[PDB]
RNA sequence: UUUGCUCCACACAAUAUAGAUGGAUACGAAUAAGGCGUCCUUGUGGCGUCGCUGAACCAUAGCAGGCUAGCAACGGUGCACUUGGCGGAAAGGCCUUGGGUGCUUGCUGGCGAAUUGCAAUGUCAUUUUGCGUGGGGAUAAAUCAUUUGUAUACGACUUAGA
RNA sequence: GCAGUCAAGCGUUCAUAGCGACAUUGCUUUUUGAUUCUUCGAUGUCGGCUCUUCCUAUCAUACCGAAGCAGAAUUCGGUAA
RNA sequence: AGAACUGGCGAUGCGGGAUGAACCGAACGUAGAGUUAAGGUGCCGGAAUACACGCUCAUCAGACACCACAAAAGGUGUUAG
RNA sequence: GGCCAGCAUCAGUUUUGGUGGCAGGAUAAAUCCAUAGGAAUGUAGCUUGCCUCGGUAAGUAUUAUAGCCUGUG
C-alpha cells in the first residue's frame, strides 16, 4: 500500500504492536518503527523486571557464548518480541525482516516523514484503566541498556525544531484557510460543494 | 459491584484558590502554596462554588472508590497545609547517654546533626528537606521541632531522624533510646 | 561514542610519520602531504573541522606521540595516542589542542609527587603455556601416567562438553592489564646532574 | 444453553383401563428449542411423580410469549444450583425487558460467578417484582433513583484499518 | 484568582438523550433513550425514523448531544409526539456530525462523469486560491 | 606486467531484481482529556468551534499524453543557474534570493489519432557491471626475502634496512 | 529423610517465646525396597586423588524480624547460594 | 503383577493432541470440484486482534481431555450466596 | 487441423446473492386505537419553611399546564 510505514511506537503494547508488524512483513510491507523506548508492556515494573531476569539466566552452560544471546535495548527488545513471530530460520524468515527496522528515537528522514499509529496496539485504547504498565525506556536501563540519557537528550532537542517546524505550518493554513474561503460563496465553490466537496 | 456513581466534597476557605487542570492540583493560600499529581487515579474534579469541589467516580469498583476518600484527603491537606501549616514535635529520649542534636550545613544543604546515641562515636545526619524548617523547641528539654506546608514532607522528615535511631543488638524494650515523634499538630494557633 | 573529525597538526615529525608505515624506506613517504596543503590557503580548511568540533563534540582527545628518539631504544618508529582532554569547556579544550600543535607537553605539567596513577600496559609473554603455571592448579602425583601437570578430571559426564570454566594449557602473558593506584615517590627532570 | 425460548409442556400419565382421564400436569420450561424443552419437563416430572416417558405422554407444547416485550422489569429469580462440595438455594434480581432474556442472563451469571455449567441449575421462581423497594438486591436498586443518569467515560472506537494517521482520543 | 476547575463534560445517558444506532437493521438512523435497564443496556424508541422500540447494548449505539424532554418510560407514541414537538431532527440534521455524513453519502454516490465534473472544478478553484495566497 | 587510477558527462553492452506503476502527506502532550480559531489580564484564563475515523488531504483531462493558435492572469510548476541561511542521532537533507527557460487542463481555437484488427504486462521501473571514446583530477603501497627479540610451536607479533 | 494442619499437654504461672501427644495432610528421590523397561556380537566393576559446575532443606559471612532478648552469650524466624 | 467383556495397537498410513505404537477423528487404487470430522482461527500458521455477560491482577497469575501431578489447613484480596 | 486462448449458448456438479407467492402460532406476542381502574422513580395546582425578587427543599395532591402501569375490547 505504501513504499514504507513509520510507527511512532509511544504508547504501543510490545506484544500486539509486535504481532502487527510482523503480518505486515511477511506481506511484503516495510515497516520501521521509531521510539522503541517509549514502548508500553502491560503489569508495573516490577514484573517486568523480573520476566527480564528470568530471560537473563538462560545461557549455554558450557560456553555462555555460543548460546542465547541477552539485547538489552528497547529497540531490540522488541525485535525478539517480533521475530519470536516470524518463521525466521527460513529464507523467507530473512527475507521479511530485512524490510524491518526498529528505532531509539527519531533520527534522519523519519523524523522529517509522517509516523502512524496502530489502534489495535495502542495501550491507552487497550488497557483498562486501573491496571499497570511498564515503559521500555526504563525497563531496558534498569537491565543495563546504555543510552537513556543520550536518547532523552537527542529527542528534547528533535522536538524543539519540529515544534518550530509545526508552529510555522499552522501558521500558513490559517492563511489557506483564509484563501479557502475568500472563494467560498463563489460559483465553483456551491458547484464544488453541491458534488460533496 | 460497580457503583454507578460516589462523590466526595473537599471544602474551599476564604484564604485559598484551587486549580486543576488534567489532574494537576495547585492549592494557593496564605501560607504559600503546593502541588500535587493525581494522574494516577482516574477521578471527575468539578467546580461547583470558589467554596466547594466534588470529586467523583463513575461506574467504579471497590478498590476504585476506595481511592475516593483519600484523593479527597489528599487534597484536603493541600488544602490545610496552606493555611494553617503542619508542626510535627519530636522527643530525645535517652535513658543514660545524652542525644545532642543540631543544624549543620555542606554546600547549602541543612542536615539534621544527631550526635552520641547511645554514646556512639558516630555522627548521624538526616537531611532537611525542602519546604520543612527544624526549630530546637526553648523551654523544652531535648524537644525538637518541624514545621512546614506539607504533612508529606513535615512527615516524612520527621519520621527519617526518628528511624535514624533505631535502637540494634540490644532488646529495644529495656533500650528504648531515639528520638519519637511525640506530638502532630497545626502551626498556626487556636486553629 | 563516536568520533567526528579530526584535525592534524601541519608539521609532523618522522618519528610520527613512520608509525604510519611498514616499510619507511623503500617508501616515498607521502603521508600527510596533501593535507599538509590545507594549511596553504589562508586557513580556510582547517578553521572548520576546529570549529566543527567546538559546535558539537562532548569530549575532546589529544593526538600525541612520543620522542622515541630520545628513549635510548633502537626503535625509531614512535607510539601515537589519544589522550582526552580534561580541563574546563570542549572550546577552550580545541582552542588549547591548536595551541600546542607542532609542540611539546612537559611530564610535570601532568604528574605530581606522591600523585596515585594507575598503569595500562601488555604484560610479558610467555608462550603457550601448561596449565600447572598458566592456572596454579595442583601438580598432579608423581605416580600418573602421560603426564602430571595436567587437570585430572577436565569435567563432568554432563554436560558432555568440556567447558569454559575449566582450565586448559595456552597462550600466558602478553595480557593487557590496567593496575591503579601506583604512588609517583619521583619526578624527575632530565636537565638535572 | 441457548437463546431462550420459554414453553408451557403439559403431560399426563398414559391413559389405564381404569383410570382415564389421568390428571394433567403442566411445566413452564426454558430451554432452546422445543425437544429439549420436553426432555427437561419429563426430566423435572420424574423428581416428582411416579411416572417416566415411557408411560406418559405430551399433551401440549406451547410457546408463551413476553407479556410486555418493551417494557422495563425488574425480575426476582429463584435458583437452586448444585456447587462442587455441595447444594445451595438462592435468590437473584435481574432488571431486564422479558423472562426469556432475564433466564439467558441468569445462566451466564451462574456460570460466571459460581462455575455452574447449564445441567447444575433448576429454576424454581422467575417473578416480576410489583412494587419497587421490594427490589432487594443493591446492584439493581442502584438502577431506580429518579432521574437517573450517567457518562460513559473513556470511550473506544473500534479501528477499520491497521494503521491510523491521528492519535486516538477517547473523548465522549 | 477565584479556582479554576476544568470540567470534563460527558454526554450522558439519560432518559431522553438521543443516540445514532451503529450496528444493523437500523443503522444511521437516529432513536431516543425511553427507560434505562443497566449499566450496558438502554431501552430505545426511534419512531420518525422507523427504529422499533426495543432493549439494545449501549455499545451498538453512540451518544450524540442532542437532548429533548422526555418522560421515562414514555411509550412509542408519546415518544413521537415530544420528538416532532421538539424538533430534534433538524438539530441533528444541521451539525457537522450529520453534515458531515450526507457529504461522504454524495461523494459515494457520483458517476464517473461526475467525478471528472469534480475534478475540473477543484482546478477553477485552484487557480483563484493559489493566486489570492500569493498576494497579500 | 604493455596506458593504468579516479571523479563528472554518453555510448554500447551485458547482469540482475523478496517484487515502482499518482504522493512514506514531519509538533508535542493528554486520554477521568484534547486540536483549531479568536479574545485578553498571557493564565491550570474567557469565548467560540471540531471529533463520532485517512471514506481524508494533495495531486488526477492532453500520441505513455502529439503538432499548433490566442486570451485572462504575474498565479502555479519543472529544469538547470545564483543569493543568503539552517541541519552531526545515521547530519548528506531542508529552507530562502535573484534573473533565465519549458509546461500550465484558469479560459477559447486549428490539426493528429483507425489496420495493434473483439483481450493477451504488451514492455515506460532501478541493481551491480564490462569495453572503448574526452572534460576535469591524482601519481602509492603491501607482501616474500633479509633483519631485531619487548614476540614466537608453525603462522602470527614486534623492530630494522637507498 | 525433610516440612505441615488440630491443640491435649510441656514451659513456676501461661496451649502456640521455645516445644507438642493422639490423630491427620504432604514433600523429597544423596536410604532401602519393589519392579524388570533399556544394555549380555560388553555402557570398565569400590574408594581416594584432581577439577569444574549446579542445587538449598544456610554451617559461616551481609541486613533484618522474635524471645521465657537486662548485659554477654544463645535460641526461633525472613531476604539470602 | 494377574483375570472379565468389548474395542484397539501388533499388521496401518492419513487429519488432530507441538512431540509420541495404543487417545480424538477417520481407515488408504490414480485424480478434479465441493463439503466436513477431531481440532483450530493475535503472530509463528490456513482461519473473526468476532460478537455477548460476568470473573480474575499473582515481587514465582493462568491458559483445555488421555497428559505429562499437588493436599490438609488458612486469607478483613475480591465476587456472588 | 497442430499449439493456446477469449466470448456465447448449454449440460453435470457446486458455491454466493437479489427478489415473488403462501402456511402455522395466544389465527404470534407487541405498537396503535378504544375503555375501565390504578399507583409512584408524584407532572400541574395548592400549603408551608428557609431563601439576591423565583428557585430550591418537604408536604398535600392521582392528569391537571407531563406521563406511566394494569385488565377488557
Ligand atoms: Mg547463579
Ligand atoms: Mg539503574
Ligand atoms: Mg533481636
Ligand atoms: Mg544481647
Ligand atoms: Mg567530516
Ligand atoms: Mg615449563
Ligand atoms: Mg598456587
Ligand atoms: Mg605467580
Ligand atoms: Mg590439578
Ligand atoms: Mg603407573
Ligand atoms: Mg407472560
Ligand atoms: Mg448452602
Ligand atoms: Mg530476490
Ligand atoms: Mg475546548
Ligand atoms: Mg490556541
Ligand atoms: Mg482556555
Ligand atoms: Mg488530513
Ligand atoms: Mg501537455
Ligand atoms: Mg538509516
Ligand atoms: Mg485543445
Ligand atoms: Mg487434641
Ligand atoms: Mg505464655
Ligand atoms: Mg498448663
Ligand atoms: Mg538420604
Ligand atoms: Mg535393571
Ligand atoms: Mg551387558
Ligand atoms: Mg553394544
Ligand atoms: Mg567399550
Ligand atoms: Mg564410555
Ligand atoms: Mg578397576
Ligand atoms: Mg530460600
Ligand atoms: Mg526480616
Ligand atoms: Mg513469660
Ligand atoms: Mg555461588
Ligand atoms: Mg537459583
Ligand atoms: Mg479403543
Ligand atoms: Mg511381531
Ligand atoms: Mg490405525
Ligand atoms: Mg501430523
Ligand atoms: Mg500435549
Ligand atoms: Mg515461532
Ligand atoms: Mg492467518
Ligand atoms: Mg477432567
Ligand atoms: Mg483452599
Ligand atoms: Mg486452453
Ligand atoms: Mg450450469
Ligand atoms: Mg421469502
Ligand atoms: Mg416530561
Redesign the interface.
Known amino acids: 500500500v505504501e513504499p514504507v510505514v513509520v510507527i511512532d511506537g509511544k504508547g504501543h503494547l510490545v506484544g500486539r504492536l509486535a504481532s502487527v508488524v510482523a503480518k505486515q512483513l511477511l506481506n511484503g510491507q516495510k515497516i520501521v518503527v521509531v521510539r522503541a523506548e517509549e514502548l508500553n508492556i502491560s503489569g508495573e515494573f516490577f514484573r517486568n523486571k523480573l520476566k527480564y531476569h528470568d530471560f537473563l539466566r538462560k545461557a549455554t552452560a558450557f560456553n555462555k557464548t555460543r548460546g542465547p544471546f541477552h539485547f538489552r535495548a528497547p529497540s531490540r527488545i522488541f525485535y525478539k518480541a517480533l521475530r519470536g513471530m516470524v518463521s525466521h530460520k527460513t529464507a523467507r524468515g530473512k527475507a521479511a525482516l530485512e524490510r524491518l527496522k526498529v528505532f531509539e528515537g527519531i533520527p534522519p528522514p523519519y523524523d522529517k516523514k509522517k509516523r502512524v499509529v496502530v489502534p489495535q496496539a495502542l495501550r491507552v485504547l487497550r488497557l483498562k484503566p486501573g491496571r499497570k504498565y511498564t515503559t521500555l525506556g526504563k525497563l531496558s536501563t534498569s537491565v543495563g541498556w546504555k543510552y537513556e540519557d543520550v536518547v532523552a537528550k537527542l529527542e528534547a532537542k528533535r522536538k524543539v525544531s519540529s515544534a518550530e517546524y509545526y508552529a510555522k505550518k499552522r501558521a500558513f493554513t490559517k492563511k489557506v484557510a483564509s484563501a479557502n474561503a475568500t472563494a467560498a460563496e463563489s460559483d465553483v465553490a456551491k458547484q464544488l460543494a453541491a458534488l460533496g466537496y | 459491584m460497580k457503583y454507578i456513581q460516589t462523590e466526595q466534597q473537599i471544602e474551599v476557605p476564604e484564604g485559598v484558590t484551587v486549580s486543576i487542570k488534567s489532574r494537576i492540583v495547585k492549592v494557593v493560600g496564605p501560607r504559600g502554596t503546593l502541588t500535587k499529581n493525581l494522574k494516577h487515579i482516574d477521578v471527575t474534579f468539578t467546580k461547583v462554588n470558589n467554596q466547594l469541589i466534588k470529586v467523583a467516580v463513575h461506574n467504579g469498583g471497590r478498590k476504585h472508590v476506595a481511592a475516593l476518600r483519600t484523593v479527597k484527603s489528599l487534597v484536603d491537606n493541600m488544602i490545610t497545609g496552606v493555611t494553617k501549616g503542619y508542626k510535627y514535635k519530636m522527643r530525645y529520649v535517652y535513658a543514660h547517654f545524652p542525644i545532642n542534636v543540631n543544624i549543620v550545613e555542606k554546600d547549602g544543604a541543612k542536615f539534621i546533626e544527631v550526635r552520641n546515641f547511645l554514646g556512639d562515636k558516630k555522627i548521624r545526619n538526616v537531611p532537611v528537606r525542602d519546604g520543612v524548617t527544624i526549630e530546637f523547641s526553648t523551654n523544652v528539654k531535648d524537644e525538637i521541632v518541624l514545621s512546614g506546608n506539607s504533612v508529606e514532607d513535615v512527615s516524612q522528615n520527621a519520621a527519617d531522624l526518628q528511624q535514624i535511631c533505631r535502637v540494634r543488638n540490644k532488646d529495644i524494650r529495656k533500650f528504648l533510646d531515639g528520638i519519637y515523634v511525640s506530638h502532630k499538630g497545626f502551626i498556626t494557633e487556636d486553629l | 561514542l563516536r568520533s567526528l573529525t579530526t584535525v592534524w597538526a601541519e608539521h609532523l615529525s618522522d618519528e610520527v610519520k613512520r608509525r604510519f608505515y611498514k616499510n619507511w624506506y623503500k617508501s616515498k613517504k607521502k603521508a600527510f602531504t596533501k593535507y599538509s596543503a590545507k594549511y596553504a590557503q589562508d586557513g580556510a580548511g582547517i578553521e572548520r573541522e576546529l570549529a566543527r568540533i567546538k559546535k558539537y563534540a562532548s569530549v575532546v582527545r589529544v593526538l600525541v606521540h612520543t620522542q622515541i628518539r630520545k628513549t635510548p631504544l633502537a626503535q625509531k618508529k614512535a607510539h601515537l595516542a589519544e589522550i582526552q582532554l580534561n580541563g574546563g569547556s570542549i572550546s577552550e579544550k580545541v582552542d588549547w589542542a591548536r595551541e600546542h600543535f607542532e609542540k611539546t607537553v612537559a611530564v610535570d605539567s601532568v604528574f605530581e609527587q606522591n600523585e596515585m596513577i594507575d598503569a595500562i600496559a601488555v604484560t610479558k609473554g610467555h608462550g603457550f603455556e601448561g596449565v600447572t603455571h598458566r592456572w596454579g592448579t595442583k601438580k598432579l602425583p608423581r605416580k600418573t601416567h602421560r603426564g602430571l601437570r595436567k587437570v585430572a578430571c577436565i569435567g563432568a559426564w554432563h554436560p558432555a562438553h568440556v567447558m569454559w570454566s575449566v582450565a586448559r594449557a595456552g597462550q600466558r602473558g602478553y595480557h593487557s592489564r590496567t593496575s591503579i593506584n601506583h604512588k609517583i615517590y619521583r619526578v624527575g627532570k632530565g636537565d638535572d646532574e | 444453553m441457548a437463546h431462550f425460548k420459554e414453553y408451557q409442556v403439559i403431560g399426563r400419565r398414559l391413559p389405564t383401563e381404569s383410570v382415564p382421564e389421568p390428571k394433567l400436569f403442566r411445566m413452564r420450561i426454558f430451554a432452546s428449542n422445543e425437544v429439549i424443552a420436553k426432555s427437561r419437563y419429563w426430566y423435572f416430572l420424574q423428581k416428582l411423580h411416579k411416572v417416566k416417558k415411557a408411560s406418559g405422554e405430551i399433551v401440549s407444547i406451547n410457546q408463551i410469549n413476553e407479556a410486555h416485550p418493551t417494557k422495563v422489569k425488574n425480575f426476582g429469580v429463584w435458583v437452586r444450583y448444585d456447587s462442587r462440595s455441595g447444594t445451595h438455594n438462592m435468590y437473584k434480581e435481574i432488571r431486564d425487558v422479558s423472562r426469556v432474556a432475564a433466564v439467558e442472563t441468569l445462566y451466564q451469571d451462574m456460570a460466571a460467578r459460581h462455575r455452574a455449567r447449564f445441567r447444575s441449575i433448576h429454576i424454581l421462581k422467575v417473578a416480576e417484582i410489583e412494587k419497587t423497594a421490594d427490589v432487594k438486591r443493591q446492584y439493581v436498586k442502584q438502577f431506580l433513583t429518579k432521574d437517573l443518569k450517567f457518562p460513559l467515560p473513556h470511550r473506544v472506537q473500534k479501528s477499520t484499518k491497521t494503521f491510523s494517521y491521528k492519535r486516538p482520543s477517547t473523548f465522549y | ?8 463534560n ?5 432518559v431522553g438523550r438521543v443516540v445514532l444506532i451503529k450496528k444493523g437493521q437500523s443503522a444511521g438512523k437516529l432513536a431516543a433513550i425511553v ?5 450496558k ?1 438502554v ?1 430505545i ?1 426511534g419512531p420518525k425514523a422507523g427504529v422499533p ?3 439494545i447494548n ?1 455499545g451498538q449505539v453512540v ?1 450524540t448531544p442532542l437532548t429533548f424532554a422526555l418522560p421515562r ?1 414514555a411509550r412509542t407514541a408519546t415518544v413521537s409526539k415530544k420528538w416532532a414537538a421538539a424538533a430534534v431532527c433538524e438539530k441533528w440534521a444541521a451539525s457537522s456530525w450529520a453534515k458531515k455524513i450526507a ?2 453519502e ?2 459515494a454516490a ?1 458517476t464517473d462523469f ?1 467525478r471528472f ?2 475534478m475540473v ?2 482546478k ?2 485552484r487557480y ?3 493566486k ?2 500569493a498576494k497579500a
Open positions: 484568582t477565584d479556582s479554576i476547575v476544568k470540567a470534563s460527558w454526554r450522558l445517558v439519560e427507560e434505562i435497564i443497566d449499566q443496556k431501552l424508541d422500540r426495543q432493549a449501549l451518544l418510560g457529504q461522504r454524495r461523494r457520483l461526475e465534473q469534480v472544478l477543484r477553477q478553484k483563484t486560491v493559489k489570492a495566497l
